[PDB]
Design a protein around this ligand. Structure first.
Ligand code: NA
Lengths: 173, 173, 173
């Protein structure tokens, strides 16, 4: 198992999330669909790597936990390294595990599961991929000690500003 | 190769399905989308395990078969044990096989295919997963000899009424 | 590793694509959904094999490339042989690699990545699957030397006319 951590951050500049409201209730419900796309940074918050991209399908409102259950299908883009694909539960109200369905580039053959940690709605999430099946060891620029997750985390000013020292080459946008 | 069978049943108490009707045609056609969530029971019908949850994309009406072709992306939830994800053909008029795209929990690393039997369209479905890649033998409460699939199958009265003896631990709802 | 190549062609007879417009923009943007289904032929263009079926989710318009980034979830159908499932990026203006999420039939246990080549927008596409995990060698009727992809390629007359000699058995339609 090779562990890989990343932060997903919504910077309010990619028109995301887009809510397609089809359930008649004022709350989320079955029928509602949410395409989305956020920014992706290294687990140490030092570099911009790319984006997340996909779709959340609303399954049910959970009024007792003041939250929503989604079923999610989406990918994680790492510039020229390639991508990882996932499929599973996305709960606004608690942490979950999603299936790693595959990948490409350095992530060709990837399998296992990924932990998703909800930090701040709708702006900050943290992930740890428990990666099996890769052909090589992950590149060192992706495997720095992660910053421990909290509501207060922020990307390095260099990474937010897209300075040469704060991005990977051909990071996805 | 480890066999796992489950019964999916639509008890019409989960606001499911929700039909999003967009096609040019009066009948089902490309453009139509069907988000869904049904209840899930063990192969021996003794216990409630959880739910199914996902999306069917209508591909074409099949007038010579008196039904429809769907392309389906969905997950199967097993309370505390984790989940299994699938993709592939959902045909209203005949049995099909879907790809197992991955899993999480005891289903971390899952691969193979699953047989979908259209027992009573659209209310009762019976599945048989041909599961490879699991870390360990499946828990016994999930592997009781399945009840042979027939039109009049019913869950155990305790499974239906959610009594301790008829539910798995923290079964998905 | 077993290579498999196929041509996907929109022959304008399958009601496809169907654009579902929700972005408040004159161009494609997040919220736009595109269900689709095209015809599939062998890499040597000698036989009709089946169809593609699935969904493209618009991520963003890409002004400087005069095109779009989609996130795509779809299957490849090969008649009685089975199906492959994929997830990943679909860029209208350049080639990409997608993840092979799984398979059924002869493709039970498939994994790896697939190269998508944008030949003529959006009507002809050429794919090469880099297939791992198959239980057996691929059938010879599927592994003829591919015709090198070009704007001017065409299926064999026998294939287009649906003669027994130009189709696989029970080719998907
Ligand atoms: Na393997």
């Amino acid at each position: 198992v090779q562990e890989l951590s990343v932060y997903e951050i919504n910077e309010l500049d990619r028109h995301s999330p887009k809510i397609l409201k089809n359930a008649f209730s004022l709350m989320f419900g079955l029928g509602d669909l949410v395409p989305f796309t956020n920014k992706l940074y290294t687990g140490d918050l030092k570099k911009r790597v790319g984006i997340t991209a996909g779709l959340c399908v609303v399954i049910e409102h959970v009024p007792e936990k003041k939250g929503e259950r989604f079923e999610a299908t989406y990918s994680f883009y790492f510039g020229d390294y390639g991508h990882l694909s996932v499929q599973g539960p996305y709960l606004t109200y608690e942490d979950s595990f999603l299936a790693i369905t595959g990948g490409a580039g350095i992530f060709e053959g990837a399998y296992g599961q990924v932990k998703l940690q909800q930090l701040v709605y709708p702006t900050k999430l943290f992930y740890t991929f428990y990666l099996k099946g890769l052909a090589n060891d992950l590149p060192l620029e992706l495997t720095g000690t992660p910053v421990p997750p909290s509501k207060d985390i922020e990307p390095a000013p260099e990474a937010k500003a897209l300075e040469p020292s704060g991005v990977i080459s051909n990071y996805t946008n």
